[PDB]
Design a protein around this ligand. Structure first.
Ligand SMILES: Cc1ncsc1-c1ccc(CNC(=O)[C@@H]2C[C@@H](O)CN2C(=O)[C@@H](c2cc(OCCCCN3CCCN(c4nccc(-c5noc([C@@]6(C)CCCc7sc(N)c(C#N)c76)n5)n4)[C@@H](C)C3)no2)C(C)C)cc1
Ligand SMILES: Nc1nc2c(ncn2[C@@H]2O[C@H](COP(=O)(O)OP(=O)(O)O)[C@@H](O)[C@H]2O)c(=O)[nH]1
Ligand SMILES: [Mg+2]
Lengths: 166, 148, 102, 85
């Protein structure tokens, strides 16, 4: 039973990548308002697990309630769109709020660049990997329509989670 | 509205917390309503890069004793806005405690609070000894000192 | 660099501060203005060895790392009309640690 | 300028004027002072505090902890209480 959490600015495709992971397709316009957690069961690296993916959405709320719920997460998945610069810029802010609720400098996360399918690029693959070095995180480029990497990210995140419990 | 509070500037200001004490530091943020919110601690000698915002008020305490620490030779820290992304530095340091407050510190770390009254000391000291540093009472005093 | 020291002789300990670049002699006269005694009549003994007036405070073994304000390094003093005498008398000793502080 | 502080035991601790002025109780009393309730061991660390208070007050850089050994702590607390420093 691992509890995952998917965050990133609206538009990157947090709902897109999650549905592909579970339902295995690619909704081309999932509502950007709805937030839901999906429970799936899979055998990751020989461990028949259960991944509860919480697909986050909505406006910022720094209440004691959204923090407590977000703190339940054991590994986070800060996605960003490689055609949206802001998405990347805001990555800093997403990482930092996670640090605070998890009460540590050390927290299980992996960056994820979604929408690699798209032709034009603003954020180049290069800067993302090096920023990931600045943090300690595996970077994984991903595509929600081509489905590439979708699984690895969602798996490598849980590898880190298992590592944290050692 | 409290006088010791942070301002919701929503303006990022990258700051360095640098623990130059031998105490485990507990950085405290005073929220927009003035209430003290703790944050992750810092071992002795440790330096960490913190994301905070302009106008935000911090104070720093021994994590276990809640004893008082200083930052930049004053007791509060409020970052300005950054200049050319130069980080704002926050050097935390033991203040010079009075020999009496030092001695209360040591004796509280060696005897549990039940055995204060079994010590061969004048009874004023028992009242002092169980007067543990409390941050809520240092805000009350600090706010009143903003008399300036 | 500042060095912090306490100069003991008989039952008398002087709490003065001097610079590592200060010479034992210059120090012998730091007792000149308080103990009222000549620098050619004073014998300063770091531990059981003695000191050439020329030696600077540091070489004798007095660095900031071991002559700090919160624990000044100690410096014996011996006083002469013809023959020099040393002897520091110990301080009081604390009571046995109470059990509640253990 | 200097002051002589005498312990109950009889040791005479000679430390600069301002250093002793660190003590509120030794400020109201003041060119020589005796104490009959403070042993030689407590007054020594007492005086050591005086030099530490004066070197490191309003220091911008970092300050080192004032050590107190467990055996002398309680007696030191009292002297501190009585001495008002
Ligand atoms: C390591 C360490 N060692 C010793 S200490 C220490 C340490 C550890 C952590 C830190 C982190 N620093 C702070 O805590 C600093 C320090 C002090 O200054 C106060 N403070 C603050 O952040 C304070 C503050 C923030 C602020 O925001 C002004 C800028 C905001 C402006 N907005 C504009 C809109 C776009 N957009 C946005 N749009 C929608 C959603 C989100 C979002 N964002 O998150 C989350 C998610 C869903 C993500 C998952 C995690 C959690 S959780 C939780 N509830 C969440 C939520 N809703 C989340 N979605 N974002 C942001 C990128 C930028 N104004 O005041 C409050 C919030 C606490 C600092 C030091
Ligand atoms: N080309 C491309 N488009 C995507 C991808 N993922 C999502 N989209 C589109 O971009 C938006 C993603 O929506 P959604 O998943 O709701 O983003 P959310 O805002 O993160 O919830 C939708 O307009 C999708 O049609 C992707 O990997 N590639
Ligand atoms: Mg959505």
């Amino acid at each position: 039973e691992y509890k995952l959490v998917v965050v990133g600015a609206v538009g990157v495709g947090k709902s897109a990548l999650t549905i592909q992971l579970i339902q295995n397709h690619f909704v081309d316009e999932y509502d950007p308002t709805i937030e839901d957690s999906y429970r799936k069961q899979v055998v990751i690296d020989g461990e028949t697990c259960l991944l509860d993916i919480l697909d986050t959405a909505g406006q910022e709320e720094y209440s004691a309630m959204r923090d407590q719920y977000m703190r339940t997460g054991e590994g986070f998945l800060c996605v960003f769109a490689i055609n949206n610069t802001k998405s990347f810029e805001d990555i800093h802010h997403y990482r930092e709020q996670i640090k605070r609720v998890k009460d540590s400098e050390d927290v299980p996360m992996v960056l994820v660049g979604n929408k690699s399918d798209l032709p034009s690029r603003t954020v180049d693959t290069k800067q993302a990997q090096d920023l990931a070095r600045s943090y300690g995180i595996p970077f994984i480029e991903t595509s929600a329509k081509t489905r590439q990497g979708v699984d690895d990210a969602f798996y490598t995140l849980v590898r880190e989670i298992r590592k944290h419990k050692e | 509205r409290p006088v010791l509070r942070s301002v919701n500037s929503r303006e990022p200001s990258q700051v360095i917390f640098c623990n130059r004490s031998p105490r485990v530091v507990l950085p405290v943020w005073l929220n927009f309503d003035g209430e003290p919110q703790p944050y992750p601690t810092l071992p002795p000698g440790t330096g960490r890069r913190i994301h905070s915002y302009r106008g935000h008020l911090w104070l720093f305490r021994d994590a276990g004793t809640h004893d008082g620490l200083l930052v930049n030779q004053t007791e509060l820290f409020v970052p300005s806005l950054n200049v050319d992304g130069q980080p704002i530095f926050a050097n935390i340091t033991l203040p010079v405690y009075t020999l009496k407050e030092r001695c209360l510190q040591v004796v509280r770390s060696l005897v549990k609070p039940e055995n204060y009254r079994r010590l061969d000391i004048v009874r004023s000291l028992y009242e002092d000894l169980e007067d543990h540093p409390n941050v809520q009472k240092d805000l009350e005093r600090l706010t009143q000192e903003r008399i300036a | 660099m500042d060095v912090f020291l306490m100069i003991r002789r008989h039952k008398t300990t002087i709490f003065t501060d001097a610079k590592e670049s200060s010479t034992v002699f210059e120090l012998k006269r730091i007792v000149e203005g308080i103990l009222k005694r000549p620098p050619d009549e004073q014998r300063l003994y770091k531990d059981d060895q003695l000191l050439d007036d020329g030696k600077t405070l540091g070489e004798c073994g007095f660095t900031s790392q071991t002559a700090r304000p919160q624990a000044p390094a100690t410096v014996g003093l011996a006083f002469r009309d013809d023959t020099f005498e040393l002897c520091i008398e110990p301080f009081s000793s604390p009571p046995e640690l109470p059990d509640v502080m253990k | 300028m200097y002051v002589k502080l005498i312990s109950s035991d009889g040791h005479e601790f000679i430390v600069k004027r301002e250093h002793a002025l660190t003590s509120g109780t030794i400020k109201a009393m003041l060119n020589e002072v005796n104490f009959r309730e403070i042993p030689s061991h407590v007054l020594s660390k007492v005086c050591m505090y005086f030099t530490y208070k004066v070197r490191y007050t309003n220091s911008s850089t970092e300050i080192p902890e004032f050590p107190i050994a467990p055996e002398i702590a309680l007696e030191l607390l009292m002297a501190a209480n009585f001495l008002d420093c």
